[PDB]
Amino acid sequence: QHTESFTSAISATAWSWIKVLVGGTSAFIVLGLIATAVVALVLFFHRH
Amino acid sequence: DKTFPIMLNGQVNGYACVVGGRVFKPLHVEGRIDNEQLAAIKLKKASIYDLEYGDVPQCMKSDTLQYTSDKPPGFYNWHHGAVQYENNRFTVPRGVGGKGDSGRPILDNKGRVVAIVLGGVNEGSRTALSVVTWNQKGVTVKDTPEGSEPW
C-alpha cells in the first residue's frame, strides 16, 4: 500500500547472530583440520 | 633367525624377515607369505611404509636385536658377504643387488640389523641401495639414492 523495500534486509539481530555463529564454526573446524594435516606432514619431512 | 621368501605363484618373489620387537614383512611386493603362522595376520601398511604389524605370539617374539645409532664404517654381514661403509650404503659389487630379492636385512656383525633394503638397484661402477633405518635418534626413516628400484 506504501513505499517499502523488502530486499532480504529483515535478518534480525538474533538471525545474524546465529548465521555468523554457524559460518564461523564451520570455517574454524575446517581450517584447524587443514592446519593439522600439514602439521603431521612436516614431522615426516623433518625425519630425514 | 627367520627370514622367509614370499610365495607368489609357487616361486619366490619377495623375502619376509622377522625383526626384534615386531614381525616384519616388506609390503612393497605381494604374494602369499610362505609361513602359515603369518598366514593369519592382519596387514598394517602406511602411505610410504611397507611393514607388517607384529602379531606373532610372544613366544618367538623379538627374533632379532634392533640397531641403534652411531653407524660404524665396519663390516656388516650381508646375505652375500660383509659390507663396509658409513656415509651411505656400501659399495656392493656390480651385478649383486639387482632385482627380485626384495626384503633383505643388513645386520651388524653383533647381530643388530642395521637397516632394511627397499631398493637401490644400481649406483654406477659401484652400487648403493635405498634402505630404511633409525634416523639419528631412533626414527624409522628411509633414504633413497637417485636411481633406486626394488632389489
Curated annotation (Swiss-Prot), chain A:
Locations listed in the record: Virion membrane; Host cell membrane
Protein origin, superkingdom: Viruses
Transmembrane segment boundaries: 25-45
Topology Cytoplasmic: residue spans: 46-48
PTM comment text: N-glycosylated.
Membrane topology category: Single-pass type I membrane protein
Role noted for this protein: Class II viral fusion protein. Fusion activity is inactive as long as E1 is bound to E2 in mature virion. After virus attachment to target cell via host VLDLR or LRP8/APOER2 and endocytosis, acidification of the endosome induces dissociation of E1/E2 heterodimer and concomitant trimerization of the E1 subunits. This E1 trimer is fusion active, and promotes release of viral nucleocapsid in cytoplasm after endosome and viral membrane fusion. Efficient fusion requires the presence of cholesterol and sphingolipid in the target membrane.
Subunit structure: The precursor of protein E3/E2 and E1 form a heterodimer shortly after synthesis. Processing of the precursor of protein E3/E2 into E2 and E3 results in a heterodimer of the spike glycoproteins E2 and E1. Spike at virion surface are constituted of three E2-E1 heterodimers. After target cell attachment and endocytosis, E1 change conformation to form homotrimers. E2-E1 heterodimers interact with host VLDLR or LRP8/APOER2 to mediate viral entry. Interacts with 6K protein.
UniProt protein name: Spike glycoprotein E1
Residues represented out of the complete protein: 1192 to 1239 of 1239
Swiss-Prot record, chain B:
Active site per the UniProt annotation: 28 (charge relay system), 50 (charge relay system), 102 (charge relay system)
Signal peptide: none
Domain Peptidase S3 positions: 2-151
PTM comment text: Phosphorylated on serine and threonine residues.
Complex formation: Homodimer. Homomultimer. Interacts with host karyopherin KPNA4; this interaction allows the nuclear import of the viral capsid protein. Interacts with spike glycoprotein E2. Interacts with host IRAK1; the interaction leads to inhibition of IRAK1-dependent signaling. Part of a tetrameric complex composed of host CRM1, host importin alpha/beta dimer and the viral capsid; this complex blocks the receptor-mediated transport through the nuclear pore. Interacts with host phosphatase PPP1CA; this interaction dephosphorylates the capsid protein, which increases its ability to bind to the viral genome.
Region (Interaction with spike glycoprotein E2): 44-49, 136-140
Superkingdom of origin: Viruses
Sequence positions bearing Phosphothreonine: 3
Protein name per Swiss-Prot or TrEMBL: Capsid protein
Function, as annotated: Forms an icosahedral capsid with a T=4 symmetry composed of 240 copies of the capsid protein surrounded by a lipid membrane through which penetrate 80 spikes composed of trimers of E1-E2 heterodimers. The capsid protein binds to the viral RNA genome at a site adjacent to a ribosome binding site for viral genome translation following genome release. Possesses a protease activity that results in its autocatalytic cleavage from the nascent structural protein.
Domain notes: The very N-terminus plays a role in the particle assembly process. The N-terminus also contains a nuclear localization signal and a supraphysiological nuclear export signal (supraNES), which is an unusually strong NES that mediates host CRM1 binding in the absence of RanGTP and thus can bind CRM1, not only in the nucleus, but also in the cytoplasm. The C-terminus functions as a protease during translation to cleave itself from the translating structural polyprotein.
Compartment list: Virion; Host cytoplasm; Host cell membrane; Host nucleus
Source taxonomy: Viruses, Riboviria, Orthornavirae, Kitrinoviricota, Alsuviricetes
Annotated positions for site Involved in dimerization of the capsid protein: 76, 109
